């Protein structure tokens, strides 16, 4: 699972434009702590862009 | 101490004294907005206390809708004169200071800590003893 | 068949506020208009700050928070701009956001005032309002301190964050003479008369009108600068009409799918 | 630390009015007359400038790290 | 046709004990015909009453000339011809006690009927032959109109 | 830490349904319109425009909890009329009123801007 | 005196019983001697109950704590069955005893 620890950008959905580092990932869901806010949200992996 | 531990407190107590005064008149939209928050309401709007010139409901009618079942209770308001009960106006109270709940309907009287508080024989106590814990829980929530 | 027929009088129209009176409408319509002024009129505001360098005495969230509150001229651009949650671009495109950059270094021996003049946009019509007066100070820089950042300003309305509130103060008033007794003064003579009171100095309240309902409503919509105040009112009426239209479409679907 | 951009209550812009306020104060205006000349009518915006403590002037007295 | 009591009263006293509520004033009235006594709480904001004002008091068990009983539910859309159309001030309440001067031996000569119109209380006391239609926990309609 | 995002005031999440009708059987000819992601802004205007209708016997709205974004409107009508029809008519009258208000406001702006 | 005026059932003033009791019951009470002896025994039992109360509560304080609020329950019965207190009752006193 290469997604964990990578800085990621949310590209679809209401959180579009939020940046963060993935904490734990599945094949369809990641736990992304948001850089912008003080939360770790759950986001579908189709809405994520690595950078 | 064979009384309730929990009663109507703070804002709801101040505003139920203000709400059940004799000159509190609610219009149609205000009554419907208040009936939206009555969980035990049967969907029938009561007949207004005044029908002409305009239909107005008193606060006692809406509280009679809040009061559950057919509770029968008699209290006195905090400002009840000591010489009123011996006077000619024993049952026609000039200051609305004698509370009579009859068939679960607030006939007259301003409610206060003496009626809706944690005292023995109060309205929430009579409601508990006659109606059970679930009906009295709904009574607390509906008042608030 | 029971719709109101409300009339409008503008009594004052400056570049910073519009003062108007609405007659022959209901209190709920007037209050929802006043609420959509504050909460549902979309403007452009900064909602994405990348800070490449920040040597100032204020931390990065402090700077970013101050940048979001800078008003940007949203007239005629916010209507054709997209919500970024609706836009199909990956990150940010000119159809949903306006890119701002700031690059200030202080090498002079005196304090540099990083104002909103230093915010430079790529769009020539979404600029800081104060840049279009004095400019809004973002940070003061000491010699050798610098602030370099890239900001994106997306479309949003004040129900989400107050930086998308287009209004400074929405004054609202009905029945200035208390002819409906919606407020009961314990002593009516202790109360100053309104700006719109029609009573002479002798009389404190109007006589109680038992048949009256609120019918005439006084507004003073001050604008923080993003939109012109008449654009605030027209966008609010359009937005309220659009909310009702969307609700009616969803309700038509739910009725025909019973 | 630094002047807020908006009035907390209403949202009027007061972040561009601090240096103008101090310039008026140096010009022997009373504080109420300086707030009147700046167009702060509501008392919510007047307490933004009236009660502001410019602490960033004190924080600029320390040399930067880099 | 459902008319429990009808009379003409003129106001003899307004708030003898002082104005205790802002919007409700207690009238003490006497009847010219039956020599009844009336104590009545009236919403004087929507229906002002002066001292010495003369009004025609009607207490009905129903608002319809048919005499047909209602349910106590607000029906604002009822186009049935109502007794309320001929009166300026209509209240709806429940008589809550009938006092009387009876003893253990002798029947009642003076009866008192106490009615609560949503908390606006009325006492109507007079001869016992005039208050036969009043029985406790029956919903009555007060109807009044000022006479000239 | 437990802060809801600011966009759940107004955004339907996937699978949330904007408005549902529930014909409550407690009283004849009444419905419960549960509108999601709305507040007092629409609830109050819909409630008052329903109260202008003479065939509407009851109209009230509530926010069950202010930390949730949900409006419950309860409409009861005369039996020759339905709460769904009352709700649609109320929204049409509100839309026509706001259209008239917008046009008269544009006329008044154009008159005062010129003079 | 007040105890006897309030709690002893008078059965000799028949024209007063005709207001509280219906005609069948008042004819039974004025005639049947077993009823009258039983009512007198009821009053006697309340008189020893009174003396026992005088012993138990020697300060004359009547406020007690008891399970069933009998007065409220009588009021509940009056409201449930729409008891008119201006009419003669159909309740035989021996049924009460
Ligand atoms: Zn885009
Ligand atoms: Zn302010």
Rounded to a whole number of angstroms, the distance from the CA of F114 to the nearest CA of chain E is 47
* Gap between the Cα atoms of F8 and C3, Å rounded: 32
Closest by alpha carbon to F53, among F83, F9, F12, F10?
Answer: F83
Backbone torsions φ then ψ of C255, nearest 5 degrees: -70, -45
User: Quick one: which ligand is closest to D40's CA?
Assistant: 2
Domain residue spans of chain F: 1-115
From the list B93, F66, C168, C75, the residue with the least C-alpha distance to E114 is B93
| The pair of three-digit structure tokens given for residue B128, joined into one six-digit string | 């508990």
H or E element that contains C257: none
Query: What does the domain layout of chain C look like in residue ranges?
Result: 1-42+163-258, 43-162
Q: Which residues, in sequence order, are bridge partners of residue C230?
A: none
Phi, psi at E15, each rounded to 5°: 50, 70
Distance from CA of E46 to the nearest CA of C (A): 6
Give the minimum alpha-carbon distance from D35 to chain C in angstroms, rounded to a whole number. 15
* Residue ranges of domains in chain D: 1-66
Residue with tokens 């003490």: E28
Task: Give the whole-angstrom CA distance, residue B133 versus residue B4.
Answer: 11
Contacts (Cβ under 8 Å, ≥6 apart) of C112: C104, C106, C140, C141, C142
Q: Hey, which residues does B52 pair with through a beta bridge?
A: E90
Ligand at minimal distance from the CA of C94 is 1
Cα E56–E57–E63 angle (5° rounding)? 115
Nearest to C85 among A9, A13, A36 (CB): A13
Nearest CA in chain G to E137: G82
Measured between CA atoms, the residue of chain E closest to residue G13 is E105
Closest listed residue to residue B45, CA positions, set F80, F59, E81: F59
> What tokens were used for B97?
């200071």
F23 sits in which H/E element: none
Ligand nearest to the CA of D46: 2
> What dihedral angle (degrees, nearest 10) is formed by the CA atoms of B23, B24, B26, B31?
-140
The annotation status of D10 as a binding-site residue, yes or no, is yes
Q: G35: part of which helix (H) or strand (E)? A: helix G33-56
Burial of residue E63 (CB within 10 Å: 0-12, 13-18, 19+) is buried
* Measured distance CA(C228)–CA(C16) in Å, rounded: 7
* Cβ–Cβ pairs < 8 A, chains B and F: 34
Tokens encoding F68: 């949730």
Do residues C168 and D14 touch, judged by C-beta distance below 8 A? no
Distance E24 CA to ligand 2 centre (A): 42
Interface residue E75 vs chain G (CB under 8 A) = no
C233 touches chain F (CB under 8 A): yes
Grouping H, G, I as helix, E, B as strand and the rest as coil, residue B25 is: strand
Question: In chain B, which residue's Cα lies nearest the Cα of F24?
Answer: B43
C14 dihedral zone (left: phi>0; alpha: psi -120 to 50; beta) = beta
Helices then strands, each counted (H, E), chain C: 3, 10
Distance CA C64, CA C58 (A): 10
Q: Are B32 and F60 an interchain contact pair (Cβ–Cβ within 8 Å)?
A: yes
DSSP per position, F27-93 = STTEEEEEEET--HHHHHHHHHHHHH-TTEEEEEEE-S-TTS-EEEEEEEE-TTS-HHHHHHHHHHH
Dihedral of CA atoms C215, C221, C227, C231 in degrees, nearest 10, equals 20
- Lookup: tokens for E135: 């029985």
Using CA atoms, how far apart are residues E73 and B61, in angstroms rounded to an integer? 12
> Best of F37, F105, F106, F114 to disrupt the C interface by mutation (most C CBs within 10 Å)?
F105
Which 8-state DSSP code applies to residue B133?
Answer: H
Residue B81 forms contact with E (CB below 8 Å): no
Superfamily of domain B10-144 in the CATH hierarchy = RNA polymerase Rpb1, domain 3 (1.10.274.100)
- Yes or no, beta carbons of D16 and C133 under 8 Å apart: yes
Question: Could you say which residues from 10 to 49 on chain A have a Cβ atom under 8 Å away from some Cβ of chain C?
Answer: 11, 13-14, 16-17, 36, 49
Q: What is the resolution of this structure in A?
A: 3.0
Q: By the CB < 8 Å criterion, does F81 face chain B?
A: no
Cβ contact, residue pair B29, F48, below 8 Å: yes
Q: Is D45 annotated among the ligand-binding residues?
A: yes
CB contact under 8 A, F55 and E77: yes
- Nearest ligand (C-alpha, residue C85): 1
Mutate to test the interface with C, among F23, F38, F39, F94 (most CBs of C within 10 A): F94
Report the alpha-carbon distance of residue B53 to residue B78 in Å, rounded. Answer: 33
Question: Hey, is C163 helix, strand or coil?
Answer: helix
Please give the Cα distance from E12 to E38 (Å, whole number): 10
Tokens of C29: 């319509």
What distance in Å separates the CA atoms of residue A45 and residue A42, rounded to the nearest whole number? 9
Asked whether the beta carbons of B63 and E56 are under 8 A apart, the reply is no
Q: What is the DSSP letter of C16?
A: S
- Per-residue burial over C27-44, b if 16 or more Cβ lie within 10 Å, else e, is bbbbbbbbbbbbbbbbbb
Q: Single out the residue of E136, E92, E128 nearest to residue E112, CA to CA.
A: E128
Against chain E, the chains showing at least 3 CB pairs within 8 Å are: B, C, F, G
Site from E104, E110, E114, E134 to mutate, G interface, most G CB atoms within 10 angstroms: E104
At residue B68, the 3 state secondary structure works out as coil
Which of C15, C20, C28, C154 has the highest number of chain F CBs within 10 A, making it the mutation to test binding with F? C28
B58: closest CA among E88, E70, E117? E117
Hey, which residues does C115 pair with through a beta bridge? C137
Residues B12-46 as b/e (b if ≥16 CB within 10 A, e otherwise) read ebeebbebbbbbbbbebbebbbbbbebeebeebbb
Cα gap C38→C232, rounded to integer Å: 9
The domain ranges of chain B are 10-144
Q: Which burial class, exposed, middle or buried, applies to E37 when counting CB atoms under 10 A from its CB (0-12, 13-18, 19+)? A: middle
Residue entry with tokens 């559950």: B68
């Amino acid at each position: 699972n290469e997604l964990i620890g990578q800085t990621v950008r949310i590209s679809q959905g209401p959180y579009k434009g939020y940046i963060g580092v993935v904490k734990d990932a599945t094949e369809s869901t990641a736990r992304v702590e948001l850089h912008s806010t003080c939360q770790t949200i759950s986001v579908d992996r189709q809405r994520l862009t690595t950078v | 101490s064979n009384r309730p531990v929990m009663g109507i407190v703070q804002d709801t107590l101040t505003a139920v004294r203000k709400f059940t005064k004799r000159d509190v008149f609610l219009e149609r939209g205000e009554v419907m907005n208040l009936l939206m928050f009555l969980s035990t309401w049967d969907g029938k709007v009561p007949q207004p206390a005044i029908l002409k010139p305009r239909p107005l409901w008193t606060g006692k009618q809406i509280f009679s809708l809040i009061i559950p079942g057919h509770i029968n209770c008699i209290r006195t308001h905090s400002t009840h004169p000591d010489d009123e009960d011996s006077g000619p106006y024993k049952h026609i109270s000039p200051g609305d200071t004698k509370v009579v709940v009859e068939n679960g309907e607030l006939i007259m009287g301003i409610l206060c800590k003496k009626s809706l508080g944690t005292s023995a024989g109060s309205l929430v106590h009579i409601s508990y003893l006659e109606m059970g814990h679930d009906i009295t829980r709904l009574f607390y929530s509906n008042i608030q | 068949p029971y719709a109101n027929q409300p009339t409008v009088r503008i009594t004052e129209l400056t570049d910073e506020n519009v003062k108007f009176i609405i007659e022959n409408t209901d209190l709920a319509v007037a209050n929802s208009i006043r609420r959509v002024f504050i909460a549902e009129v979309p403007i452009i505001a900064i909602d994405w700050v990348q800070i490449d360098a920040n040597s100032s005495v204020l931390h990065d969230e402090f700077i970013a928070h101050r940048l979001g509150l800078i008003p940007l001229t949203s007239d005629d651009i916010v209507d054709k701009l997209q919500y970024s949650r609706d836009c199909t671009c990956e990150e940010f495109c000119p159809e949903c956001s306006v890119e701002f950059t700031l690059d200030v270094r202080c090498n002079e021996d005196q304090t540099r005032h990083v104002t909103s003049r230093d915010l430079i946009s790529n769009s020539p019509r979404v600029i800081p309002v104060t840049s279009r007066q004095d400019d809004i100070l973002i940070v003061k820089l000491r010699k050798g301190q610098e602030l370099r950042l890239r900001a994106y300003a997306k479309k949003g309305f004040g129900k989400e964050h107050a930086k998308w509130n287009p209004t400074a103060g929405v004054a609202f008033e009905y029945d200035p003479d208390n002819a409906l007794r919606h407020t009961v003064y314990p002593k009516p003579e202790e109360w100053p008369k309104s700006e719109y009171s029609e009573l002479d100095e002798d009389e404190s309240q109007a006589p109680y009108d038992p048949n009256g309902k609120p019918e005439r409503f006084y507004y003073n919509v001050e604008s923080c600068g993003s939109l012109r105040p008449e654009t605030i009112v027209l966008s609010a009426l359009s937005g309220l009409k659009k909310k009702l239209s969307d609700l009616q479409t969803q309700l038509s679907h739910e009725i025909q799918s019973d | 630390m630094i002047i807020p951009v908006r009035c907390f209550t209403c949202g009027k812009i007061v972040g561009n009015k601090w240096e103008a306020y101090l310039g008026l104060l140096q010009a022997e205006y009373t504080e109420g007359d300086a707030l009147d000349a700046l167009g702060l009518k509501r008392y919510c915006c007047r307490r933004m400038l009236l009660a502001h403590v410019d602490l960033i002037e004190k924080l600029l007295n320390y040399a930067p790290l880099e | 046709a459902g008319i429990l009591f009808e009379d003409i009263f003129d106001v003899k006293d307004i708030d003898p004990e002082g104005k205790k509520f802002d919007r409700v004033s207690r009238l003490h009235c006497e009847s010219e015909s039956f020599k009844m006594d009336l104590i009545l709480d009236v919403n004087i904001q929507i229906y002002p009453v002066d001292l010495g004002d003369k009004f025609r008091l009607v207490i009905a068990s129903t608002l319809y000339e048919d005499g047909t009983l209602d349910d106590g539910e607000y029906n604002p859309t009822d186009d049935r011809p109502s007794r309320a159309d001929q009166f300026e001030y209509v209240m709806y309440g429940k008589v809550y006690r009938i006092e009387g001067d009876e003893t253990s031996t002798e029947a009642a000569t003076r009866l008192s009927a106490y009615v609560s119109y949503g908390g606006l209380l009325m006492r109507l006391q007079g001869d016992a032959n005039n208050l036969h239609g009043f029985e406790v926990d029956s919903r009555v309609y007060l109807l009044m109109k000022k006479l000239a | 830490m437990n802060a809801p995002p600011a966009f759940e005031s107004f955004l339907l999440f996937e699978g949330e349904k904007k408005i549902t009708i529930n014909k409550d059987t407690k009283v004849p000819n009444a419905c419960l319109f549960t509108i999601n992601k709305e507040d007092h802004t629409l609830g109050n205007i819909i409630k008052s425009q329903l109260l202008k209708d003479p065939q509407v016997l009851f109209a009230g709205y509530k926010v069950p909890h202010p930390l949730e974004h949900k409006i419950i409107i309860r409409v009861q009508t005369t039996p020759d009329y339905s709460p769904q029809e009352a709700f649609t008519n109320a929204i049409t009258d509100l839309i026509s009123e706001l259209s008239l208000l917008e046009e008269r406001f544009r006329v008044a702006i154009k008159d005062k801007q010129e003079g | 005196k007040a105890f006897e005026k309030k709690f002893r059932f008078d059965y000799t003033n028949e024209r007063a019983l005709r207001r509280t009791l219906q005609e069948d019951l008042v004819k039974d009470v004025l005639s049947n001697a077993h009823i009258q002896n039983e009512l007198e025994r009821e009053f006697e039992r309340m008189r020893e109950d009174r003396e026992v109360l005088r012993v138990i509560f020697p300060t004359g304080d009547s406020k007690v704590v008891l399970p069933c609020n009998l007065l409220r329950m009588i009021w509940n019965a009056q409201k449930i069955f729409h008891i008119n207190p201006r009419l003669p009752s159909d309740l035989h006193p021996i049924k009460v005893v």
